[PDB]
Structure formats: structure tokens, C-alpha cells
Amino acid sequence: KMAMIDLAKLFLASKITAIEFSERICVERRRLYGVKDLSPNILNCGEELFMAAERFEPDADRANYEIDDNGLKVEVRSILEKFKLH
Amino acid sequence: QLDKKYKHAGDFGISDTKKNRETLTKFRDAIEEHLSDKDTVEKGTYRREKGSKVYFNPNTMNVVIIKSNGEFLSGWKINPDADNGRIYLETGEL
Numbered sequence A: 001k002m003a004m005i006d007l008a009k010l011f012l013a014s015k016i017t018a019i020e021f022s023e024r025i026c027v028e029r030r031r032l033y034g035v036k037d038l039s040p041n042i043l044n045c046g047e048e049l050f051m052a053a054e055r056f057e058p059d060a061d062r063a064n065y066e067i068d069d070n071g072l073k074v075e076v077r078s079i080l081e082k083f084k085l086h
Numbered sequence B: 001q002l003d004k005k006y007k008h009a010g011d012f013g014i015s016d017t018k019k020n021r022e023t024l025t026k027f028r029d030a031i032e033e034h035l036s037d038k039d040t041v042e043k044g045t046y047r048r049e050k051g052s053k054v055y056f057n058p059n060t061m062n063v064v065i066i067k068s069n070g071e072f073l074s075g076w077k078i079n080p081d082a083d084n085g086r087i088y089l090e091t092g093e094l
Helices: A002-013 A018-032 A040-054 A069-082 B007-014 B021-036 B083-091
Strands: B053-059 B060-067 B072-077
Touching: A002 A018, A002 A040, A002 A069, A018 A040, A018 A069, A018 B007, A040 A069, A040 B083, B007 B021, B007 B072, B021 B053, B021 B060, B021 B072
Parallel strands: none
Antiparallel strands: B053 B060, B060 B072
């Protein structure tokens, strides 16, 4: 379904935090994993959201490739736009 | 590092939604069992973590990323139907 996309939208609307999004996105991804008859565009968008969240690290000592709250927000928006799932 | 990655525990056969000393150790054992499994072999790297080595199990489809220094970074289940997954399977780039 659009569960992962909606979660992304909830996060962009700041209804849920970066930490909340990074955790729930894992729950949702697992739920849709393997689920037949899934739109490639939707599946791939979810996967990129999943990887974007994997790069999120709230700590100030995060790695050079990791991102903070802002940044996760920009990448998530960029990802939804890439797949045209605003 | 194990606590912040518990979000992926569910990919390693642990559905406990609770994150406590008990469930964490279960996750720790789940990771050890993955790495020790005869069918788990080195395959690719997690580029961003330049120098990292990933260990894949084609049965469970799980990968576990280890840093150059040998420390556990993260891990999750590969989805062969998604581009990222297919790309990893074909090129080893995670």
C-alpha cells in the first residue's frame, strides 16, 4: 500500500519526529516486504526512504555520510519528488 | 550500536517490539548466528562506510555490515525485487 509514503508525508509535515519516522519506516517496510502485486514505483520509493532513514543519526558525532534531522527532511522530500509521489 | 539498530531486529527473526536488555541480547545472538552460519559469506561493501565488508546469507537474504575495524555497523534483509536489492546482488554495492 502507501503506508511508507504516508509515513514519509507525516514526517515532512512534522507530525512525527525523525526518530519516530526512522523507526516506523522499518516496521512498515517489513510489512510490505514480499507483498505481491506491488507498484515498482512505490516499492522503490519505499526502499530509498528506508536507506535515507538508515543514514539518519541524531548524535553530533555522526559520521560524515550520516545526516541530522534537517537533511533527513530534505532527502525524504527529494525522494518523494523523484518518484512523483508527493 | 546494537541499541540504535534494534529497529532492524525484526529482519533477524526477532519480533519483540520491546527494546530491553533481554531483546537486545537476542538481537546480539541473532547477529552472531548470522555471521557464524556456514551459508553466510562476504559479499560487497556499504560504500559510504568506506572499507566496510558485508556478509550475506542467500537463504534469509540478510546482510550484516562490519566496519574496517571489525565493529558491527548495521544489518537488514535484502529485497531482491527492489532496485537497491537487485543492484546489490549483481554488483555487491549496498
